[PDB]
Design a protein around this nucleic acid. Structure first.
Lengths: 259, 104, 117, 66, 70, 88
RNA sequence: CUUGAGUCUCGUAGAGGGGGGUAGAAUUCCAGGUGUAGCGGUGAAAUGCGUAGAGAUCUGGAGGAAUACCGGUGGCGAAGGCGGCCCCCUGGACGAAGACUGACGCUCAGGUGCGAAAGCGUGGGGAGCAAACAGGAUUAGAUACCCUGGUAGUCCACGCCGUAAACGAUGUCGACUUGGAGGUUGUGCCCUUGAGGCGUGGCUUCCGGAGCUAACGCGUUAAGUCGACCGCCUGGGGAGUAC
């Protein structure tokens, strides 16, 4: 009756758009496709690679619940964007938690700087930070035992584009993209960027707060022309890339991957 | 009457003459009960390209609510005056009293 | 002749023939060479190789001036564009600036009519 | 992803040279609305501003000219 | 496309950079375009035709894609 | 176009209520004034054809209005044409 | 009487029109410097320009014409058409609310006006381009295509001409009939918590349903379902010609 109308606004009230409410129960597993049902119009074709943790093998059997993401509806048939990004929000929440007590503590282990800041990895994910953040002083973890255990003390974060440089060792110590496009500029600043869509000439890795990068086909590997970028890297994956070129005018930052 | 916005560029050797010129311009405006809402000596400035062989010039901004006859007169004066290299009298909807972004 | 350390190389690259002209920084030409002059005619002189050899010839010609530094100004569309500069480099000048100086009108004169072939 | 919609500007200013400089080429040319992602209404205004600037020698018409 | 060779920069790299700059400019293309007079009508026709082609590529092909090849 | 103040003045004079504005007579007056204004312009600018089209249209409209007035109420029309000095 | 039609208020976007200024790039020519044998052109050549110093290159000057980028199945205009920037004069469109007028409307034979390009007249101008013309090729020939030159003309003023595949090959005005993806330009609300969310108007591009259609296709911008008015067709040629 209005039973159904009320039930509709009820079901509106008991779901939201992003990957927030851990609701999809894994109702069939087959390599290489997981699939859930979070109270959406259809079931997700999940990769297996959004769900294996830190050494390669699966972690969740039938009935298990992770939220995914949304705001994109129907490409022909199907429903979602991946739950792994979901996870990013959780990471953001832990990073935010720092603010409360002015100190987020986990483990951060940063061996080296792709682009001037040691890389820190938290749980499954690994992030890149600006060069200062790795060390509190001028200590430098190059003399430290390799891939050492500390935590991360945050030095610097870019707040829009996601780059976070964190503080290893020293426990005792405690319009918008395009005007100032000189931060990752200078010749070869390495970046960690998720690829988006590979347009048979390109790969379109673009992460640093509303920009566009290409890594088109010529570098990508150490073979030139026979490569076909879909075979050689991925879809949706955070990779090794650096700038090699910026035009701040005809917004074409032309990144590379052969480095 | 009509809110104009004027920017004229003086030859850099006549930079010491500029204030007098400005005063004169103001006076004329005042004469016909015309208001002058902002007035900004930008000073000596490097040109993006060398107009009439010279590389710097002295820019003056000036916003005026005046009758069009006086504007015309001003334009005429500018054209004949050899100190002022370029001018650009340019209509505007409102008074726009707040300062320019290059002054700030 | 007065020796000069730094100068310009003007590379006039047409569809039919490349012309390389080495000059001082002020404008006064020191030497020049062409693909047509280098012993290439018609099909041959409208090629990168021809351009390169012209460039080489030009370089040879301005040996007595003792030019070390060189800025290149590349004009027009042609094969003799990249090749010529490479040749120049090989010949052994420190290439300082590489400028493009193609005359692009801002819609000015009417071009000649389109060929019917 | 237009800047002027977000800022919410009433009119683009030719005097605001820095802003203009983001939308102009290394060669001096005005950058397309595909690349910048500027809104159409604003784009025209921006272009006009640039033109004005060029007249006032605030921006250059081109890189080569002198 | 004005360029200056950086300190301890290779020649080849510089050349490449220059080429890239040129490409960006679209100077060669421009030159090609202005070689001969294009009648206004012709210009119009090309533009519209090109647009049409683009549209065809975008939508029809997308529709095709939905269905598998084998 | 006709300046706001002028328009207002016109309305006040011819319009009975002064808030009315849409009275036939008032409308006619407005048209007439505009036409008069444009005469000066068109003496100067004889090749301004596009602009003249608008003027022509306005004239036509005025004529129509006059015609309408005539059938409805003759005396009023007569008065109007005395005021404005319209030959017909 | 107020639903059609119009008037008033405030805004909005616009290559809409007319007039007058100005800017920068590029071509051409002139004067001079540097410099030395080629340049130019093509499928390949030659005519042509060059040692009387060309081409290249730099400096200065003259003058005309057009406005790169922006720039878009973008915008404006009744159509023709309209594109750097600035000012003056000026026409239309749309939206927001109200207020007013009170059928004042629609269509239109004759009539009147506007009407690309070429063309004509008189007077200016003349850089580039280029009918005609000349030479060089090509060819069996080449009164063409290609090359080198090149005059009317293109440009401005004021007149005339009154036609174009002047095309959406689709008269104008009004009403009604499933949808989707855009673009552009308003405007109301909403925590603009952000580039957004939900509407509501105008103009516009593409796809497609019913229906229609000889089919192709059209499809809320109809070529569907209807009404009002006008224009026009009656086998091909002869002929849009003769008188």
């Amino acid at each position: 009756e209005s039973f159904a109308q009320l039930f509709e606004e009820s079901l509106k009230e008991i779901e939201t758009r992003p990957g927030s409410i851990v609701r999809g129960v894994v109702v069939a597993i087959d390599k290489d496709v997981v699939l859930v049902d979070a109270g959406l119009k259809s079931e997700s074709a999940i990769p297996a690679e959004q769900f294996k943790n830190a050494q390669g093998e699966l972690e969740i059997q039938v009935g298990d619940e992770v939220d995914v993401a949304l705001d994109a509806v129907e490409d022909g048939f199907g429903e979602t964007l991946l739950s792994r990004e979901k996870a990013k929000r959780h990471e953001a929440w832990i990073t935010l938690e720092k603010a409360y007590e002015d100190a987020e503590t986990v483990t951060g282990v940063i061996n080296g700087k792709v682009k001037g800041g040691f890389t820190v990895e938290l749980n499954g994910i690994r992030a890149f930070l600006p060069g200062s953040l790795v060390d509190v002083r001028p200590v430098r973890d190059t003399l430290h035992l390799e891939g050492k255990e500390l935590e991360f003390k945050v030095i610097k974060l870019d707040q829009k584009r996601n780059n976070v440089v964190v503080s290893r060792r020293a426990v005792i110590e405690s319009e918008d993209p395009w005007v100032a496009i000189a931060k990752r500029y200078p010749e070869g600043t390495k970046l960690t960027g998720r690829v988006t869509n590979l347009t048979d000439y390109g790969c379109f890795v673009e992460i640093e707060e509303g920009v566009e990068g290409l890594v088109h086909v010529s570098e990508m590997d150490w073979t030139n022309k026979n490569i076909h970028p879909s075979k050689v890297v991925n879809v949706g994956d955070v990779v090794e890339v650096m700038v090699l070129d910026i035009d701040e005018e005809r917004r074409r930052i032309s990144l590379g991957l052969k480095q | 009457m009509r809110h104009y916005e004027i920017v004229f560029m003086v030859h850099p050797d006549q930079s010491e003459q500029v204030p007098g010129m400005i005063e004169r311009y103001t006076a004329a405006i005042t004469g016909a009960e015309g208001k002058i809402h902002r007035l900004e000596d930008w000073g000596r400035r490097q040109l993006a390209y060398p107009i009439n062989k010279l590389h710097k010039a002295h820019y003056v901004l000036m916003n005026v609510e005046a009758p069009q006859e006086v504007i015309d007169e001003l334009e005429t004066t500018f054209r004949f005056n050899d100190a002022v290299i370029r001018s650009m009298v340019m209509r505007t909807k409102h008074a726009v009293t707040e300062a320019s972004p290059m002054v700030k | 002749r007065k020796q000069v350390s730094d100068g310009v190389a003007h590379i006039h690259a047409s569809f039919n023939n490349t012309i390389v002209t080495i000059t001082d920084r002020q404008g006064n030409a020191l030497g020049w060479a062409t693909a047509g002059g280098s012993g290439f005619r018609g099909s041959r002189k409208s090629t990168p190789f021809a351009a390169q050899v012209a460039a080489e010839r030009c370089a040879d010609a301005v040996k007595e001036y003792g030019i070390k530094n060189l800025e290149v100004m590349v004009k027009g569309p042609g094969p003799g564009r990249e090749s010529t500069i490479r040749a120049l480099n090989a010949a052994g000048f420190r290439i300082t600036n590489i400028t493009d100086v193609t005359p692009i009108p801002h819609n000015g004169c009417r071009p000649p009519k389109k060929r019917r072939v | 992803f237009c800047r002027f919609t977000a800022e919410g500007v009433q009119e683009i200013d030719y005097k605001d040279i820095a802003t203009l400089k983001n939308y102009i080429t290394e060669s001096g040319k005005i950058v397309p609305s595909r690349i910048t992602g500027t809104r159409a209404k604003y784009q025209r205004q921006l272009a006009r501003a640039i033109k004005r600037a060029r007249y006032l020698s605030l921006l250059p018409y081109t890189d080569r000219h002198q | 496309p004005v360029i200056k060779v950086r300190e301890n920069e290779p020649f080849d790299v510089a050349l490449r950079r220059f080429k890239r700059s040129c490409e960006k400019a679209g100077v060669l293309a421009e030159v090609r375009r202005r070689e001969f007079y294009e009648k206004p009508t012709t210009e119009r026709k090309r533009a519209k035709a090109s647009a049409v082609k683009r549209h065809a590529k975008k939508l029809a092909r997308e529709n095709a894609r939905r269905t598998r090849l084998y | 176009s006709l300046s706001t103040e002028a328009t207002a003045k016109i309305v006040s004079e011819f319009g009975r209520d002064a808030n009315d504005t849409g009275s036939t007579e008032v409308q006619v007056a407005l048209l007439t004034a505009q036409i008069n204004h444009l005469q000066g312009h068109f003496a100067e600018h004889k090749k301004d054809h596009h602009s003249r089209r608008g003027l022509l249209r306005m004239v036509s409209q005025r004529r129509k209005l006059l015609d309408y007035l005539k059938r409805k109420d003759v005396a009023r029309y007569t008065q109007l044409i005395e005021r404005l000095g319209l030959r017909r």
